[PDB]
């Protein structure tokens, strides 16, 4: 059915205790405990009678005026006619404040509303009745309110507060007798710092749980119109903090809705950070960070290096995101999920620069004819992929990996893969690059289509023709063309269509 705070849901008996003394409480006295409603405890009854009733009074009912008349009369008796103009809600708040302050712990039937043991039991059961969200809210309340007081108050002050809570006459007398205990109490002038500390904590919490929904709505509606960088710039927040808030909001929504969180979101918001920082760590081994990816010459050493770097930075994104131009190769949601989920590491380590794809298309070759006929067609099938890569004098140069793996190269390195069914196919980009020395860097800024052209950049035909390529001078080009073009004309020995009448 419906379970809430008013009607406590039935919980399991084997639940662990929340407070420390109940963990050491003996089992017999644990079994002695009854199963009672929350208000059956004297502290719960006191709360329901004093504070919860006044909280309910603000709701629309019939006895509201009847009780408000009495409370207003009491307030007028307290403060002459000044409090007549005070609002009814203000009067209720004042009464609640006074009843909270005048609360005392002592003998149950001697005037005190409830005992310290009853208060401890109520606190323990109230903590037990909380779920994960309840405990999270409890910790939030602790951080908002109690933590500044603890940070600003001395252990002597805490012990004095404990003595006040227990309200033991002899123990209070013993604590007050000590001269050092009298002199070690804190000063209100120093305790005033707790106000500013609490304000700062509440300011951070307000940032989180009030600017999270707004930033989340803006970034979910129009991520390209409101990127995290723009949101941080316009709201004065930290650029990293905005993304952290978005991630936290989405993950908390998933967790409190009992849905598996979108694990791709931290990758999509910290793509650069994910590649840079997230690593697998061994036990007992201390690790370091590479300040620079390689040993290179700085761009300040030469005037041309400086110009090259500034031009590349101009052509480069400051912060690349999921919707930007380099990620336009993820047409459908299948591509989107595949790229951003469980394979982003390999997908980003495949190629350093960001290109309009992740690899190269795979095309399959044709099998050489086998004159043995069907007596040998089976022999090229096996249980494994047989991968072959060309080596030789002209192949295997690490410094020429890009030019050797360029598909538009007539002397491209030749790779073949025989599948377990005999199919001869080409190799993927990662498969081709696996044969060279590994490159373990990435580029998240430079995007080639944004390069400058026209101003200061104009490739000229004169520079290329300075080599003077002449077909009558060198005929290797004609030889390669002859090699490429078909040769079936040689068996016909002007080409003309057949004549049939």
């Amino acid at each position: 059915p419906q379970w809430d705070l008013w009607q406590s849901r039935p919980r399991s008996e084997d639940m662990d205790e929340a407070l420390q003394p109940f963990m050491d409480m003996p089992k017999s006295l644990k079994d002695r405990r009854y199963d009672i409603p929350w208000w059956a405890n004297p502290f719960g009854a006191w709360y329901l009678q004093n504070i919860l009733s006044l909280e309910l009074l603000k709701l629309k009912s019939k006895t509201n005026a009847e009780k408000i008349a009495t409370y207003r009369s009491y307030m007028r008796s307290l403060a002459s006619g000044k409090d007549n103009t005070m609002s009814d809600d203000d009067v209720i708040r004042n009464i609640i404040k006074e009843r909270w302050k005048t609360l005392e712990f002592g003998d149950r039937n001697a005037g005190y509303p409830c005992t310290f043991g009853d208060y401890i039991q109520f606190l323990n059961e109230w903590f037990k009745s909380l779920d994960e969200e309840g405990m999270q809210r409890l910790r939030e309340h602790f951080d908002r309110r109690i933590r500044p007081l603890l940070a600003v108050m001395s252990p002597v002050d805490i012990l004095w507060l404990e003595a006040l809570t227990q309200n033991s006459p002899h123990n209070k007398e013993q604590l007050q007798r000590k001269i050092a205990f009298q002199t070690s109490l804190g000063t209100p002038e120093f305790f005033d710092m707790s106000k500013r500390l609490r304000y700062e904590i509440n300011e951070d919490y307000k940032v989180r749980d009030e600017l999270g929904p707004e930033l989340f709505a803006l970034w979910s509606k129009a991520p390209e119109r409101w990127p995290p960088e723009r949101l941080s710039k316009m709201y004065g927040l930290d650029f990293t903090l905005v993304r952290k808030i978005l991630v936290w909001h989405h993950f908390k929504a998933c967790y409190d809705a009992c849905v598996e969180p979108d694990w791709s979101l931290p990758k999509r918001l910290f793509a650069l950070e994910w590649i840079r920082d997230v690593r697998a760590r061994k036990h007992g081994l201390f690790y370091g960070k590479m300040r620079f990816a390689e040993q290179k010459i700085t761009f300040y050493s030469d005037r041309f290096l400086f110009r090259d770097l500034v031009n590349r930075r101009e052509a480069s994104y400051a912060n690349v995101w999921e919707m930007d131009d380099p990620y336009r190769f993820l047409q459908t949601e299948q591509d989107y999920e595949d790229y951003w989920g469980d394979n982003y590491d390999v997908y980003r380590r495949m190629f350093p620069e960001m290109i309009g794809r992740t690899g190269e298309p795979v095309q399959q070759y044709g099998q050489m004819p086998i004159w043995a006929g069907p007596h040998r067609q089976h022999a090229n099938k096996s249980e494994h992929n047989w991968m072959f890569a060309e080596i030789g004098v002209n192949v295997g140069h690490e410094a020429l990996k890009k030019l050797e793996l360029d598909p538009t190269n007539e002397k491209r390195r030749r790779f073949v893969i025989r599948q377990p069914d005999g199919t001869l196919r080409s190799a993927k980009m990662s498969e081709m690059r696996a044969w060279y020395w590994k490159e373990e860097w990435a580029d998240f800024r430079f995007w080639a289509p944004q390069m400058e052209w026209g101003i200061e950049n104009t490739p000229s035909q004169e520079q290329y023709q300075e080599h003077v390529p002449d077909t009558t001078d060198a005929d290797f080009r004609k030889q390669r063309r002859i090699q490429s073009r078909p040769v079936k004309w040689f068996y016909e020995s002007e080409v003309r269509w057949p004549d049939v009448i």
């Binding site: 420390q20 401890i120 606190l123 309110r145 109690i146 006040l164 809570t165």
Partner: peptide, 28 residues
Amino acid sequence: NEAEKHHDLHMFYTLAWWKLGEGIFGVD
């Protein structure tokens, strides 16, 4: 190995904070 249950955080609520904070438990 053992997870920190942070049960010592709950012990601070057993101190009658209404005496000094003047009813901080409620909404404010």
